[PDB]
Amino acid sequence: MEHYISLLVKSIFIENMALSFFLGMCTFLAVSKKVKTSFGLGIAVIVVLTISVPVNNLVYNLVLKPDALVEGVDLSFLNFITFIGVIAALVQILEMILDRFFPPLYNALGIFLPLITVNCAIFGGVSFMVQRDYSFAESVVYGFGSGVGWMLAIVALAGIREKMKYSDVPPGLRGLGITFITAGLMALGFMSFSGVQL
Amino acid sequence: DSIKKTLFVVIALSLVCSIIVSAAAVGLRDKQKENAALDKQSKILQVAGIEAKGSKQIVELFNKSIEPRLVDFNTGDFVEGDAANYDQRKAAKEASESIKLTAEQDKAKIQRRANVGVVYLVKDGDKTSKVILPVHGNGLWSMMYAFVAVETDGNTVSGLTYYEQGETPGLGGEVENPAWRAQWVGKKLFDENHKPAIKIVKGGAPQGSEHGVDGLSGATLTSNGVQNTFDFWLGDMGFGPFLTKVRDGGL
Amino acid sequence: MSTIIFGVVMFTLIILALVLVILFAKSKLVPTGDITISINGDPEKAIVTQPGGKLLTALAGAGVFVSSACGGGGSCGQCRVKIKSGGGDILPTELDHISKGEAREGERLACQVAVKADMDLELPEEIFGVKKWECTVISNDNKATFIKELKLAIPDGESVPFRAGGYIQIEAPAHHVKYADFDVPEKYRGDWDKFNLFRYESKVDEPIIRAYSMANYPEEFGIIMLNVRIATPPPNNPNVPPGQMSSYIWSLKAGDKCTISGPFGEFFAKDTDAEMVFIGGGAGMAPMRSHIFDQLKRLKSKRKMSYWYGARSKREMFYVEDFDGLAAENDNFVWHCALSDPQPEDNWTGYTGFIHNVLYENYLKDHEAPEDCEYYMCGPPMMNAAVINMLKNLGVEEENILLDDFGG
Amino acid sequence: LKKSVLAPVLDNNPIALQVLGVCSALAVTTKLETAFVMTLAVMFVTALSNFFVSLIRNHIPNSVRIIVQMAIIASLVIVVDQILKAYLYDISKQLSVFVGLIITNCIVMGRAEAFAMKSEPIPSFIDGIGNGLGYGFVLMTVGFFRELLGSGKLFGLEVLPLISNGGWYQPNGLMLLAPSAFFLIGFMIWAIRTFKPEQVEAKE
Amino acid sequence: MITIKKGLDLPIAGTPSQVISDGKAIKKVALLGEEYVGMRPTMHVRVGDEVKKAQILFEDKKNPGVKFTSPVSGKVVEINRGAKRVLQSVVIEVAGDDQVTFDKFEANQLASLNRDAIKTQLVESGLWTAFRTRPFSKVPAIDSTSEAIFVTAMDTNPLAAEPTVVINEQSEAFVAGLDVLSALTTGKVYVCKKGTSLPRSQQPNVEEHVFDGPHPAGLAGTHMHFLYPVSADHVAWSINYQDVIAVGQLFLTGELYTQRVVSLAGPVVNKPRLVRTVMGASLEQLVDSEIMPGEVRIISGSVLSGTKATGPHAYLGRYHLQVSVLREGRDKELFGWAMPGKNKFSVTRSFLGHLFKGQVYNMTTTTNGSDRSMVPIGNYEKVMPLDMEPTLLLRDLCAGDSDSAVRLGALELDEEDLALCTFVCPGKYEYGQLLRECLDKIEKEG
Amino acid sequence: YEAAATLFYTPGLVTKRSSHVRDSVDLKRIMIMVWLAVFPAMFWGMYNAGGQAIAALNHLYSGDQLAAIVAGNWHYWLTEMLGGTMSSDAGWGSKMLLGATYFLPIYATVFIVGGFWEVLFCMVRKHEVNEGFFVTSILFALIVPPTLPLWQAALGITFGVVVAKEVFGGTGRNFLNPALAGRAFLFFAYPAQISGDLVWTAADGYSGATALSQWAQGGAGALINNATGQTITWMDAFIGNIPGSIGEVSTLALMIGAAFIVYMGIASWRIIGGVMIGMILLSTLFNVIGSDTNAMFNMPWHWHLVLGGFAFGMFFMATDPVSASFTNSGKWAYGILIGVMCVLIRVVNPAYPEGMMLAILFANLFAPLFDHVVVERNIKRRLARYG
Ligand SMILES: Cc1cc2nc3c(=O)[nH]c(=O)nc-3n(C[C@H](O)[C@H](O)[C@H](O)COP(=O)(O)OP(=O)(O)OC[C@H]3O[C@@H](n4cnc5c(N)ncnc54)[C@H](O)[C@@H]3O)c2cc1C
Ligand SMILES: CCCCCCCCCCCCO[C@@H]1O[C@H](CO)[C@@H](O[C@H]2O[C@H](CO)[C@@H](O)[C@H](O)[C@H]2O)[C@H](O)[C@H]1O
Ligand SMILES: Cc1cc2nc3c(=O)[nH]c(=O)nc-3n(C[C@H](O)[C@H](O)[C@H](O)CO)c2cc1C
Ligand code: FES
Ligand code: FES
């Protein structure tokens, strides 16, 4: 159980997707105005990663790995299209399921799936799972921890941006520039976990 | 009707894109592998002291002067196998050709060791004048890889190079420094009792020593990693028996 | 080459499997069912249509259409409907136009409502009779240099049921009109020849709809009189396309056939005993004349009234005979006109300058309680802003200032 | 004419006005060579995907539109990746993940969905070239600053002699880390909206 | 019962002597137009018109039916209007003693009256302006109703009078007013007071609650927070003890009762006391020959929530029951921000004045500093007894955010409920103005 | 000077509105009271810097080789010129001179370069020059090693003032600690002038470690003063006879100043108690579970306190009002997170010997989240009609 807790806490803190690898920085900087919307988006991202990374692990190990389907062929030049198609299809079917069967959950979190349908966060998570060569349980834990870390970072940025209702920002910086500077200071703060090897 | 048109569009686009992609990807495999080999070939040529400019010159000089081999670490002797295409990282990650180093043996913090290691012999004709050993260990931020070119005496070093380090570019990333790497030519590895003797001295090594190398300034935690790297790869668990064989002769 | 074919087949099968799975999950998770929108709680007569669609479009196709002027976009904000159980959200574009006070009562602009489930409405009763007509232009004479007083006749001599201040909508099919056919008399030909508007020509390729305020008070039966200004390109940007609906209305001549659609209205007069102060200008003479003639002939009210009209010159004044007749017959009504810059040909002996300054100096500067009378106003936006500023600096509330800006 | 190409540089900038396309700007701008290669790759992909999606815009069914567009874009990016690995191997290693992340890059998909779907073949290529020009402008500015102040080099040429090789300059460490790109793009947005004050956002 | 822990009893020199001594005869009164929240007047009298007592002077445009009648009989002498012709005061030169007389009742008949009859008599007399809703602190519409009527039979403002010393004279009128309020309430009537005894109403609707502690506690907002929390769905009315006395006198004798017992006191008052005066009197004539010489500032009400009395506003307010006179501080002191303060007051402990317990200060009207930004050191929590987050609410008011202020509890407050937060601010902020702007926004839009 | 006349005299202003009587405290007095509380720490830091420098100098060089070393460094020959001595028998005055020749130039550089940006921003935006930069400047000047190059101090104060504070609005408008954001700039940008064994004792050619680096290597048996050859005891680290950043060294003096600024109600005992609670809990957990190859696993709670900049940041930099939480219940969590993260970076992070600027800079991002949690628990109480 020590090998799975280390991966979880590492993916949450030591390697944050939004503040270390910077995956999904347009939705991050754009939807960080309210903590309610940020919370809903973080929940949607958690769900999408948790569903998408293990499925792609299975598909890769079954079809796209070298010498996996025929002893002597390498079908790894289809990783990109396979991963992106699987992600898009899963997101759309999840949206339709949540719409028809559970409108209570649809209004809650299923509204943010159109934004993260094709997002760099999930594709980078899958592309990192492929490099790390995880097992199925490690893929599940990595996806979940990465989603939780992304949610934490975006909720923190939203809280800071709500605290900044009292600020007095120069007109040329109001909007995008001060958000970029804020995210830079947030990354500078998150650099505490640099030397930790977990 | 509608479904038929969607299916037709999807299938036609998919066939076109698949022809194009699978034609582009399979026609460049050999060139991609050649490019992937060129990097390590050029680094080895740089360690060996052979000056080579141009990819064709690199390939020619490597195929002429260098000779890769395979070495068993326990017995310390050559083995029969495909040496030019050996992947030591995969061999160490695979549970068939790798042993798990306990905490008392893992001086370098690598946690695994491939049973068969690859070495290179710098030849000029038939006589062998050097041998390039790939050693590696853990430093403060990342695992560091090196090439140490020891002479046929088994003790004297002729050069050294860190080709994959990943540490702070001005404190501990000075393992790639020319003035620090020039401190290794002439250094001996073993004492008279045939024990590891390389020492990374904190504070500066005495002028004109035999086993003394200056430590990195402001970086004692990457210097400790270099010292541990050599403590492992010069002991019984690494290139100890093979270096003993080389010292006895026959290289 | 044995991996090229394998990769091609694998790509094809992956993409086809994904597309088929998406289509199958689509065919099992969409309703494709009807929706019974009931416009009122009581009647059984409801509207059964397809789910995918907009509420305003569905209601218009059904036969109960609200006064949608901007034809989609929320620019005018007039597709106001009241839902008691329907789309559970207020899209921000509508949340602007609908304050917290009305949004709580379930009101919403019909344009950006999303029809996805059974919804029920509560509409007012003045929308049910909104039937169209097939009118015949009697005359399109020129009463001002830039204003054509159009007069329409309703077939079967049926006077439309409306209130003083309402506004019809006029439809115009795709057509082309040149400024060569516009009839202006030698009295107004001066500025036309000076500016060379006769070079202009319109271009409309889609049926359009606009709103126009009636200039006749209800007791004048069987007529729809308008005061239409020309929407000529500004004197700064002459390359911009010209006024579509204005050019079409000016192209209308005597005897032609035009279609008007339903009586509307929100700019109405309050029923109190307080003094009334009308401040009209430019093309805003239609609602002002409607209000004044209504209050003076249909109701025979005794409230103290006053009319204050602005004009660029003595050639811009019209309806002056009617207003002099009213002021001569009644003691309540008293009106005054003011020219911005007169000409020596007019021999003007009267008030000059802007109408806000004229009203302030002559009437409001010495008036006892400037805050106790009601102020009705319609004209150019500059005049609107100036008069509102003057009234707010004299200390008048927004509840008494009841203006109508002709589309901003 | 060329207004459609030269607008996104300063007038309607992707990274500076419509937040689309930030991750690669933050990641690959540590070195001007990688920044330039990524600029060229994004121009290539955006232009060709716009052209092809506009060519087949009328037959794409709305039910599986996303799959078709992502298939075209992924094919383009896979071809570009297999060409980078064969001819620029030292830069592909440094661009490893963000070479493939061009698929989920927002500029490509946004210009495919918004403009290419409702426009002409040739002007779609032009819009792709313009968006790539703006994106590369931002990339190359940030990369110039970071590579000149963090290592003293430009494209691999020592402009400022470092203090190891007997020089006067001691390089900055933040210009090789995370927050420097954020700070540089924020001050770039400041300097842009100081000269084009029509982009300044509303107060409240 | 309820013991308030956080607050501040302000030590200021000149505490009055609770002995009611008659006051100087007044010659002018006035109704201050700018003190009724959200009121736009329709004047009924013109300069030079002879009026009677309880005769209408103006009505409300934004509150149809509510009439603002005259406190005394005389002759309208001035109608002071300011910027944008905003009404400031309707002065009346006292002459004659004519009045408008209403219907009489007895003690037995007062508790079983009808709400409609009570409303007609109150509105026609002009005592309807003694009530104040929550939120927005406006006069209740003549057609509304509220399940909670709060009587404020305690006063804890600095230098304020003692409610007991006044009620022990008009016990009968007080009980009759409580009976009338119990017939009008439709819910209950909350007589919030101190530990001491008071005349008692026998009705089961009337309830006496006891509050203890420093002063954020003589306010009706504390009472509402602790007994009947208000929102947009639940509104509660508010009235003080002398207005209950006036209501009882109206419904017992027929004629309007316009007497007051204010507490004229302050640091620069020669002899502080309680001066029996008239309703709406003139402060310039009420305070003359009773103040130390110098440059002083007369205030209608306490020094925390009170109006400066200058020019057209130099008359006793409607909801104000005390006058506070204190000097004007305009002298610049060298290194005054650094001198160890043995004579300076603070809720912090960075001065030497807190070590001397029971010390009293001759305070003036200085802001002991300049206008800065809010660095929150936690002074607002020391003087906020309610169940809110003080600094976050205050920052949502300064920021200009109305929705978040309403969420954090701005619909439960009045301008007097932030007087101590204005007091203890290092940045010299004034939160009553910000709260009033937020409430105007909320009331207007929505 | 009219611009300088705002500091001497009170404004002499009256109240125009609601509360006609105001409190006596202002922001000027608050900032000057916080500025006067770091004076014992500053003076002991000067004394300690001088004493450590003289001891380390007399360790290596002695005889005619001290002459060539004190004649080659302007600090040394300026001390000897003004009157002090550099021999081993130097008194307490000759050591405070030598520490002042290091602190005063750094303080002057920081003050001037930061005041330039302060004045420029407050002049472009048409405001009065706001105090509260005195605290930032003096804290930045005392959390730095004795041997910074002055250009790096200028760059650091520029980054701390402009980017962290003045680009958001100024005093009371930011969300991050300006002094610890200017030192994080200098720590991660120029990492060898603010780390290692050669930057903390100002003796030319003396290399030695500090006690949170000698503990990480050998534990309590490795704590030793190489310049004198004696064991660093607990009362040495408590009083402050140890090398380190200029003012961080004297826990006694920091306690003396913090007791004053906490009595006056300026600093938050809730934040201080939260920091202490978190530190004690995590340090005791690590002591309990233990480790064989890590020597920082057995450092108790009373050694974490007297070593590094724990007491300088627990007392003066954690209690920053603008960057802390705004709720009484959020301040506890703020302090607890600060202490936990400090102990964590000390123990389980191998590259950084301490972690207090990085623990506070982390908690500065999550303070508003604790505020949000508390206020959202409060808002639900109000809807239930009980608040
Ligand atoms: C309730 C109501 C009542 C009204 N009553 C009257 C009435 O009694 N009489 C009356 O005359 N009007 C009235 N109006 C105004 C009504 O909108 C008129 O139709 C108006 O004159 C616009 O006419 P139009 O459709 O021809 O102009 P449009 O064709 O809609 O607009 C053309 C105008 O806009 C400019 N323009 C057009 N395209 C562009 C472009 N691309 N860029 C820049 N500028 C451009 C042109 O220069 C010209 O000025 C009323 C409006 C409302 C809402
Ligand atoms: C601000 C004043 C209030 C502070 C109050 C004191 C709080 C103390 C709470 C913890 C109490 C126990 O105190 C803690 O015990 C541990 C072991 O558990 C002791 O620790 C000691 O023994 C352990 C046993 O393994 C060793 O590993 C360790 O190296 C050694 O220091 C310390 O003495 C102290 O760190
Ligand atoms: C108790 C107290 C502690 C403070 N601590 C700091 C600090 O650590 N760093 C700093 O730059 N300013 C500090 N200040 C000054 C001020 O709070 C700082 O400028 C704010 O961060 C405003 O930006 C402090 C002020 C007070 C009253
Ligand atoms: S359609 Fe007229 S407002 Fe939307
Ligand atoms: S969202 Fe545009 S690049 Fe990740």
Residue numbers in the entry:
A (entry chain E): 1 to 198
B (entry chain C): 6 to 256
C (entry chain F): 1 to 408
D (entry chain D): 7 to 210
E (entry chain A): 1 to 446
F (entry chain B): 27 to 413
Question: What does the publication say?
Answer:
The Na+-pumping NADH-ubiquinone (UQ) oxidoreductase (Na+-NQR) couples electron transfer from NADH to UQ with Na+-pumping, generating an electrochemical Na+ gradient across the inner bacterial membrane, which is critical for energy-consuming reactions such as rotation of the flagellar motor, ion homeostasis, and uptake of nutrients. Na+-NQR is the first enzyme in the respiratory chain of many pathogenic bacteria such as Vibrio cholerae, Vibrio alginolyticus, and Haemophilus influenzae. This enzyme is an intrinsic membrane protein complex composed of six subunits (NqrA–F), encoded by the nqr operon, with a total molecular mass about 200 kDa, and contains at least five redox cofactors (FAD, a 2Fe-2S cluster, two covalently bound FMNs, and riboflavin). Since Na+-NQR is exclusively found in prokaryotes and is structurally unrelated to mitochondrial H+-pumping NADH-UQ oxidoreductase (respiratory complex I), it is a promising target for highly selective antibiotics.
However, the density map of the region in the cytoplasmic NqrF subunit, facing the membrane-embedded subunits (NqrE and NqrD), was relatively weak and blurry compared to other parts of the enzyme. To obtain the structure of the cytoplasmic domain of NqrF, focused 3D classification without angular alignment, following local refinement on the NqrA and NqrB subunits was carried out. The focus 3D classification resulted in 10 classes; we selected the three, in which NqrF was clearly observed. As a result, we obtained high-resolution structures of states 1, 2, and 3 from 82,790, 80,882, and 72,234 particles, respectively, at 3.1-Å resolution. Atomic models of the cytoplasmic domain of NqrF of the three states were built from the resulting density maps. Figure 1A and B show the density map and the atomic model of Na+-NQR, respectively, taking state 1 as a representative. The atomic models for three states are almost identical except for the flexible cytoplasmic domain of NqrF. The positive patch in NqrA, formed by Arg40, Lys61, Lys62, Lys84, and Arg85, interacts with the negative patch in NqrF, formed by Glu368, Glu371, Asp372, Glu397, and Glu399. In addition, negative tips of NqrA (Glu443 and Glu445) are in close proximity to positive tips of NqrF (Lys100 and Arg104). The final high-quality density map allowed us to build an essentially complete model of all six subunits containing 1894 residues (98% of the total), except for the disordered N-terminal region (Gly2 − Leu26) of NqrB.
